[PDB]
Design an enzyme around this catalytic site. Structure first.
Site, mmCIF file in Angstrom:
data_model
loop_
_atom_site.group_PDB
_atom_site.id
_atom_site.type_symbol
_atom_site.label_atom_id
_atom_site.label_comp_id
_atom_site.label_asym_id
_atom_site.label_seq_id
_atom_site.Cartn_x
_atom_site.Cartn_y
_atom_site.Cartn_z
ATOM 1 N N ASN A 93 10.569 2.167 -9.270
ATOM 2 C CA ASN A 93 10.568 2.812 -7.842
ATOM 3 C C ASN A 93 10.762 1.533 -6.933
ATOM 4 O OD1 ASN A 93 8.218 2.568 -5.703
ATOM 5 N ND2 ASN A 93 7.484 2.717 -7.874
ATOM 6 N N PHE A 139 6.899 2.842 0.963
ATOM 7 C CA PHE A 139 6.153 3.503 1.750
ATOM 8 C C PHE A 139 6.774 4.508 3.003
ATOM 9 C CE2 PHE A 139 3.107 -0.114 1.826
ATOM 10 C CZ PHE A 139 2.508 0.099 0.510
ATOM 11 N N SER A 169 1.944 -3.403 -3.405
ATOM 12 C CA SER A 169 3.658 -2.935 -3.379
ATOM 13 C C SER A 169 4.776 -4.231 -3.615
ATOM 14 C CB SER A 169 3.879 -1.966 -2.277
ATOM 15 O OG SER A 169 5.161 -1.367 -2.471
ATOM 16 N N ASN A 187 7.408 -3.423 -2.560
ATOM 17 C CA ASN A 187 8.678 -2.943 -1.824
ATOM 18 C C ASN A 187 8.574 -3.022 -0.581
ATOM 19 O OD1 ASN A 187 9.810 -1.977 -4.451
ATOM 20 N ND2 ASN A 187 8.389 -0.239 -4.628
ATOM 21 N N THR A 188 7.629 -3.697 0.159
ATOM 22 C CA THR A 188 7.555 -4.335 1.538
ATOM 23 C C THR A 188 7.637 -5.607 1.307
ATOM 24 O OG1 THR A 188 6.474 -2.018 2.063
ATOM 25 C CG2 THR A 188 6.274 -4.230 3.492
ATOM 26 N N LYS A 204 -6.477 -2.618 -3.710
ATOM 27 C CA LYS A 204 -5.089 -2.336 -5.013
ATOM 28 C C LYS A 204 -4.443 -3.663 -5.083
ATOM 29 C CE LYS A 204 -2.142 0.926 -6.829
ATOM 30 N NZ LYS A 204 -1.785 2.535 -7.079
ATOM 31 N N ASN A 261 -1.138 -2.111 -9.606
ATOM 32 C CA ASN A 261 0.101 -1.289 -9.197
ATOM 33 C C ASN A 261 1.332 -1.861 -10.241
ATOM 34 O OD1 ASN A 261 2.299 -0.483 -7.562
ATOM 35 N ND2 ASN A 261 0.831 -1.076 -5.790
HETATM 36 C C1 LIG Z 1 7.254 6.773 -7.645
HETATM 37 C C2 LIG Z 1 6.064 5.941 -7.151
HETATM 38 C C3 LIG Z 1 5.597 5.873 -5.973
HETATM 39 C C4 LIG Z 1 4.209 5.328 -5.879
HETATM 40 N N1 LIG Z 1 3.813 4.989 -4.696
HETATM 41 C C5 LIG Z 1 2.726 4.327 -4.621
HETATM 42 C C6 LIG Z 1 2.091 4.231 -3.359
HETATM 43 O O1 LIG Z 1 2.705 4.618 -2.278
HETATM 44 N N2 LIG Z 1 0.759 3.713 -3.164
HETATM 45 C C7 LIG Z 1 0.351 2.827 -4.244
HETATM 46 O O2 LIG Z 1 -0.944 2.308 -4.146
HETATM 47 N N3 LIG Z 1 0.868 3.035 -5.450
HETATM 48 C C8 LIG Z 1 2.137 3.859 -5.522
HETATM 49 N N4 LIG Z 1 2.486 3.921 -6.867
HETATM 50 C C9 LIG Z 1 2.003 3.307 -8.013
HETATM 51 C C10 LIG Z 1 0.859 4.044 -8.941
HETATM 52 O O3 LIG Z 1 -0.100 4.472 -7.990
HETATM 53 C C11 LIG Z 1 0.869 3.711 -10.014
HETATM 54 O O4 LIG Z 1 -0.290 2.381 -9.609
HETATM 55 C C12 LIG Z 1 1.770 2.799 -11.096
HETATM 56 O O5 LIG Z 1 2.802 3.571 -10.753
HETATM 57 C C13 LIG Z 1 1.150 2.465 -12.205
HETATM 58 O O6 LIG Z 1 0.387 3.426 -12.805
HETATM 59 P P1 LIG Z 1 1.151 4.509 -13.846
HETATM 60 O O7 LIG Z 1 1.754 3.642 -15.006
HETATM 61 O O8 LIG Z 1 0.436 5.566 -14.526
HETATM 62 O O9 LIG Z 1 2.231 5.205 -13.223
HETATM 63 C C14 LIG Z 1 3.786 4.545 -7.171
HETATM 64 C C15 LIG Z 1 4.233 4.687 -8.284
HETATM 65 C C16 LIG Z 1 5.479 5.498 -8.325
HETATM 66 C C17 LIG Z 1 6.071 5.444 -9.838
HETATM 67 O O1 LIG Z 2 6.033 3.075 -2.043
HETATM 68 C C1 LIG Z 2 6.213 2.083 -2.585
HETATM 69 O O2 LIG Z 2 7.197 1.858 -2.826
HETATM 70 C C2 LIG Z 2 5.122 1.656 -3.584
HETATM 71 C C3 LIG Z 2 4.060 1.373 -3.204
HETATM 72 C C4 LIG Z 2 3.198 0.704 -4.097
HETATM 73 O O3 LIG Z 2 2.120 0.667 -4.047
HETATM 74 N N1 LIG Z 2 3.690 0.592 -5.447
HETATM 75 C C5 LIG Z 2 5.239 0.866 -5.818
HETATM 76 O O4 LIG Z 2 5.425 0.719 -6.830
HETATM 77 N N2 LIG Z 2 5.837 1.272 -4.755
#
Ligand SMILES: Cc1cc2nc3c(=O)[nH]c(=O)nc-3n(C[C@H](O)[C@H](O)[C@H](O)COP(=O)(O)O)c2cc1C
Ligand SMILES: O=C(O)c1cc(=O)[nH]c(=O)[nH]1
Ligand SMILES: Cc1cc2nc3c(=O)[nH]c(=O)nc-3n(C[C@H](O)[C@H](O)[C@H](O)COP(=O)(O)O)c2cc1C
Ligand SMILES: O=C(O)c1cc(=O)[nH]c(=O)[nH]1
Lengths: 335, 335
Positions: free
Chosen positions: A110, A114, A174, A176-177, A216, A245
Site C-alpha cells: 500500500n 493517510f 508510514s 507514504n508521507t 508506532k 509498520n
Molecule cells: C492498506 C493498509 C493501510 C494501512 N494504514 C495504516 C495506517 O493508516 N496507520 C498505521 O499506523 N498503519 C497502517 N497500516 C499498517 C498496518 O497497521 C500493519 O501495521 C502492517 O500492515 C503490518 O501488519 P500486517 O502484516 O498484519 O498487515 C496499513 C496497512 C495496510 C495494508
Molecule cells: O496510510 C498509509 O499509507 C499508511 C500508513 C502507515 O502507517 N503504514 C502504511 O503502510 N501505510
C-alpha cells in the site's frame, strides 16, 4: 465459509473490495445482521499500559481509517480496535491505484498516504460507537505540514481525542508521507516525544485521567537506530511501542506480480523481519515498557512467536484479509 | 479441495491415516493409475552437490521409509524424493501410539524410532522405480548397534545402496534412537565422517559413479556445537548438510493437546528455529558446502525464507500433511 468469500472479493481490486466490505458493515451495524458478523471467542483478559484488554488480539490501524465500523469489527471478537491513521485536516492521500495484492505471498503493498476525513469526523464517529473493548486511536501528520513542525499535528489530534481514546498511537513509521520516518531519528524523536508527553500531562489535568501513548515504529530501522529509539522511548516515559509498520524490503517477493510497486509491504513477507525487530527491541527495553507486536501474523503459532520475542499484545491487518474472521477465532482461542 | 480431504483424514489417528493413504499410493505407484495424483509443475532446475535437481523442492525423509511409492510421490511434482530412514536390518520401531497431531499448531510429534523393513528390501523397491527426479536414500543406525560401532551400520547401507542412490543422507539427528545425537558431537562425529568418506571414494572407483553424501543435523544444537559440526563437515569434505530434523523444544505449543508427548516436534512450531539454525550454519560454512533446508515449511514465502538464510534446496513433510499436494505446486511454481 471464508475462502469462498475471498475468491469473490478478490475479483475486485483491493481498495474496491474494502469499500464494498465496509459498505456492508456500515449497513448491518445495529441490525439483526450485526449477528451475521458476530463471532463468539473465549475471553483471554490481559493488562497492558494500564488498560484491561478483552483479549490479546487487536485490529491494526489502517482498516478503519475513519472509525466508521467500530461496532461491527468489534463484534468479530477483537480484544481491541485501532482506528486511524487520522490527521488534523482531511486529505485524500496518494493517487489510485495505491494498494496491491501479492496473492501467492499472502502479502499487500500500500501507498495510501493517510487518506482520511480528519480528526473531527473520527471523533463524531467514535461518539456514536458502543464497542466495549479497548479503542486505539492512531494519529499522524498532514502531508502539507512541514516535517520539522510535525509535532504540532500530533498535539492538535491529542487534544480532540483524549476524552475518547482508550490509548493513543503515534504514527511516525508510514513510508507514504515524505520524510515522516525521519521523526523517529535523533533529536527529532526527542523533540517530538517531549512535546507529546507534555501535552499528555496538560491533558491529564484537564480531563482528570491518564490516556497512555504508544509510538508506532518502522521495521526498517538499523540496529543502532533501534537501540536509540528504545532509549528515547524509555527516557521520555512513553507508555508503549507498536512494532511494526510496513517494510520497504522486497527481497522475499522478487519475481512476483506487483513486487515493484512502491510503498509498504505487509502480510506474510514481513513476518520474520517484524519478529526480529520485536526481539531486538525487547532486549533493549528490558521490561520497561510493553511492545504491541504486529507484522505478518497469520496463525496461532505466528502470534505466539511474537509473544515469545517479547510482545504483550498482537495486531493483524493482512492476515485478516487473507484468512478472514476464522483467524481471529484461531488466535484468541489458542494464543 | 484438500481442506475437505484433510477433515476426513484427520478423523483417523495419524499413523492409521498414513497407512490408509499409503495403501492407496502403493496400488497406483508406477502404473497409469497415477494420473489420479499427477500434478504438472514448471521446470526450475537447480545445480546442487554436483547433481541437477529438476526443481528445488524435495520430499523429506520419513514419509516413505521403505521406498514403496517413489513414482506416485514423484508424479505429485517433487524435484527430489528422499526415502528412508532405513537401517541394515529391519526393526519395528517404538511402541504405538508414536505419532501425534497438533492441528491448531499445524505440527506433529513423533517417536517412531526408525520403523523400516531394512536396506535390502528398500533396494528392491528402488530397483522397480522410474522417477526422473533425484532420489535420496536416508540411512540410520539399528537400535541395538552400540553408538560406538554406529559407523558400521552406515557403511553396510552405503555398500548396498550406492549403485542406486542419487545422493545419500546420513541421519544422525533423530531423537528417537537413544544416544544417536551424540554422533554429531566432537570426536564421535569426526570418526564417523572419516569412515563414511573413505567408503565413498571406495564405492566411487568400484561403481564408477559419483554419489554425493549429506549429513542431516538436529535443530537443538548449541552455537558452539553448530560451529564444531560445520567445521567438521568442511574438514571431511562432506558434500552437503540437511538442516534440520525434528526438535525437542515445546515453547510454542504449551497448553495444546499432546504437547507433552515425548519425541520430535515438526511443522509450523519448528519453522522459526529451523530457519535460524540454517542462517547460523550458513554464516559458518561461508558457501563451502550447500544446505538443504527443512523444517516447518508450509508456504512459498517460508520456503524463500530458508533460501534467504542460505539453503540451496528445501524439503517438506509436515506441511505436506497439513496443506496437501497443492503446497508442492505453490512452492515449485513461485519459489
Ligand atoms: C492498506 C493498509 C493501510 C494501512 N494504514 C495504516 C495506517 O493508516 N496507520 C498505521 O499506523 N498503519 C497502517 N497500516 C499498517 C498496518 O497497521 C500493519 O501495521 C502492517 O500492515 C503490518 O501488519 P500486517 O502484516 O498484519 O498487515 C496499513 C496497512 C495496510 C495494508
Ligand atoms: O496510510 C498509509 O499509507 C499508511 C500508513 C502507515 O502507517 N503504514 C502504511 O503502510 N501505510
Ligand atoms: C512422522 C515423521 C517421520 C519421520 N521420519 C524421518 C526419518 O525416517 N528420517 C529422517 O531423516 N527424518 C524423518 N522425519 C523428519 C522430517 O524428515 C523432517 O526433517 C522434519 O519433520 C522437519 O520438516 P517438516 O517440519 O516440514 O516436517 C520424520 C518426521 C515425521 C513427522
Ligand atoms: O523415525 C524416526 O524415529 C525419526 C527419525 C529422524 O531422523 N527424525 C525424527 O524425528 N524421527
Amino acid at each position: 465459509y471464508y475462502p469462498f468469500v475471498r475468491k469473490a472479493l478478490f475479483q475486485l481490486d483491493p481498495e474496491r473490495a474494502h469499500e464494498f466490505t465496509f459498505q456492508q458493515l456500515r449497513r448491518i451495524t445495529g441490525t439483526p445482521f450485526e449477528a451475521l458478523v458476530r463471532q463468539k471467542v473465549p475471553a483471554k483478559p490481559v493488562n497492558c499500559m494500564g488498560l484491561t484488554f478483552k483479549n490479546p488480539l487487536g485490529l491494526a490501524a489502517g482498516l478503519d481509517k475513519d472509525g466508521e465500523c467500530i461496532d461491527a469489527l468489534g463484534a468479530m471478537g477483537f480484544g481491541s480496535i485501532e482506528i486511524g491513521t487520522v490527521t488534523p485536516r482531511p486529505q485524500p492521500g496518494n493517487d489510485k491505484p495505491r494498494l496491491f495484492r501479492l496473492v501467492d505471498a499472502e502479502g499487500l503493498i500500500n501507498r495510501m498516504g493517510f487518506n482520511n476525513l480528519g480528526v473531527d469526523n473520527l471523533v463524531e464517529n467514535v461518539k456514536k460507537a458502543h464497542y466495549d473493548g479497548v479503542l486505539g486511536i492512531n494519529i499522524g501528520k498532514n502531508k502539507d505540514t512541514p516535517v520539522e513542525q510535525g509535532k504540532d499535528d500530533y498535539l492538535i489530534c491529542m487534544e480532540k481525542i483524549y476524552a475518547y481514546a482508550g490509548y493513543i498511537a503515534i504514527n511516525i513509521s508510514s513510508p507514504n508521507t515524505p520524510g515522516l520516518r525521519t521523526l523517529q531519528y535523533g533529536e527529532a524523536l526527542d523533540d517530538l516525544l517531549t512535546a507529546i508527553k507534555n501535552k499528555q500531562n496538560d491533558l491529564q489535568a484537564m480531563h482528570h485521567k491518564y490516556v497512555p501513548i504508544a509510538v508506532k515504529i518502522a521495521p526498517d530501522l538499523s540496529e543502532e537506530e533501534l537501540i536509540q529509539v528504545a532509549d528515547s522511548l524509555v527516557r521520555h516515559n512513553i507508555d508503549g511501542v507498536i512494532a511494526t509498520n510496513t517494510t520497504l524490503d522486497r527481497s522475499l517477493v522478487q519475481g512476483m506480480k506487483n513486487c515493484d510497486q512502491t510503498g509498504g509491504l505487509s502480510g506474510r513477507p514481513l513476518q520474520l523481519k517484524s519478529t526480529e525487530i520485536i526481539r531486538r527491541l525487547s532486549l533493549e527495553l528490558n521490561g520497561r515498557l510493553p511492545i504491541i507486536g504486529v507484522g505478518g501474523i497469520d496463525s496461532v503459532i505466528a502470534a505466539r512467536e511474537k509473544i515469545a520475542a517479547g510482545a504483550s499484545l498482537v495486531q493483524i491487518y493482512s492476515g485478516f484479509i487473507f484468512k478472514g474472521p476464522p483467524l481471529i477465532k484461531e488466535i484468541v482461542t489458542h494464543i
